[PDB]
Design a protein around this ligand. Structure first.
Ligand SMILES: CCCCCCCCCCC1=C(C)C(=O)C(OC)=C(OC)C1=O
Ligand code: SF4
Ligand code: SF4
Lengths: 146, 197
């Protein structure tokens, strides 16, 4: 289920009330996160669970939850690179209902998109390195894309 | 190891050998190419004829418009089907001794033009003495072919007179340049990287 802030604490625990807030009522067993917990680490643990509990049937969950896991691991260690949060948002919008075979992957990406929506400064603080996908090959001039 | 026109040995008194060596020296040091323009390879040939390369230094700048006065036919260009009888007639109009250099992939084999209107190499209908790969060969490749032809001319046996002696032409079977340069070509390890100038 999606994370909610303290402003949403004055909301009735009904399906339709939490639905319009941008979350799900779910099992109605709420879990509270204090200020001491880094949200990047918490969502990394959540995504590690959701990526190791994939059944491997369908491509977006099976091959996109580990990509988000590795991105969140890089953000945890400060090794994030530009385009990582954009990749997380693309994963969130491309693992929704209908895109994947079952509902495990939308429920996987709901806390990720909620944490990006409400706590983007914690995710932006993990990007410290410039983007580097290629290493220089001697004798070959690279295509310096702008 | 020669070729008589059959694989025979070297036919070469000692005064006749000196006379043959003098004749071969005069023939290889004075080679008159025929002015024949087929395609782009002719442009690189005449580039070799100009001041920045100076093919005149080898005595091979007298470019004749008449096949009678020319000794060397450089087929430098594509051998088109309409141009092939012209090439054969111009080769037939030449006089002994005559030598042929195929310049470029078109004259060697047809090159990239394996097409309905191209004869696949000039060795299909005239005998070639020296082949040059390239499309086009650079001018110094034409110079190197001229030195290859000179080395081939210097070790061939031809009759001194048409009334005395054997009238057959004995052309030497040279070692291939590939086998000769295989020692120095395989030993190459590192070349300059292409990103520099
Ligand atoms: C019967 C008339 C004979 C005229 C003189 C012919 C022999 C000299 C050719 C000179 C020459 C010309 C014109 C020439 O155009 C040329 O460039 C391809 C040369 O090579 C560098 C030449 O050597
Ligand atoms: S979304 Fe569901 S069906 Fe697809 S691989 Fe994940 S657990 Fe399996
Ligand atoms: S070998 Fe290449 S450069 Fe020479 S005549 Fe043919 S197309 Fe032109």
């Amino acid at each position: 289920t999606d994370f909610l802030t303290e402003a949403h604490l004055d909301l009735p625990m009904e399906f339709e009330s939490i639905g319009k807030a941008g979350s799900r009522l779910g099992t109605a067993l709420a879990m509270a996160v204090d200020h001491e917990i880094n949200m990047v680490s918490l969502v990394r643990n959540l995504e590690e669970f959701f990526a190791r509990e994939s059944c491997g049937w369908c491509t977006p969950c099976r091959d996109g939850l580990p990509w988000s896991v590795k991105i969140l691991r890089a953000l945890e260690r400060g090794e994030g690179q530009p385009g990582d949060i954009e990749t997380l948002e693309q994963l969130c919008r491309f693992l929704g209902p209908g895109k994947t075979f079952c509902a495990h992957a939308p429920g996987a990406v709901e806390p990720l998109q909620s944490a990006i929506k409400y706590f983007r400064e914690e995710f932006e603080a993990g990007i410290k390195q410039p983007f580097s996908n290629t290493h220089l090959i001697n004798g070959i001039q690279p295509n310096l894309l702008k | 190891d020669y070729t008589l026109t059959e694989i025979v040995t070297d036919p070469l008194n000692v005064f006749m050998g000196k006379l043959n060596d003098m004749v071969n020296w005069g023939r290889k040091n004075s080679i008159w190419p025929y002015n024949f323009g087929l395609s782009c390879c002719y442009v690189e040939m005449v580039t070799s004829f100009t001041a920045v390369h100076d093919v005149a230094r080898f005595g091979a700048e007298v470019l004749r418009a008449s096949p009678r006065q020319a000794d060397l036919m450089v087929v430098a260009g594509t051998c088109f089907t309409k141009m092939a009888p012209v090439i054969q007639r111009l080769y037939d109009q030449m006089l002994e001794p005559k030598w042929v250099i195929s310049m470029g992939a078109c004259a060697n084999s047809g090159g990239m033009y394996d097409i309905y209107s191209v004869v696949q190499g000039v060795d299909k209908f005239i005998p070639v003495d020296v082949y040059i790969p390239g499309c086009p060969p650079r001018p110094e490749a034409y110079m190197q072919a001229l030195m290859l032809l000179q080395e081939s001319i210097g070790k061939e046996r031809r009759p001194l007179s048409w009334v005395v002696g054997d009238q057959g032409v004995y052309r030497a079977n040279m070692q291939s340049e590939r086998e000769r340069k295989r020692g120095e070509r395989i030993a190459v390890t590192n070349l300059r990287t292409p990103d520099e100038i």
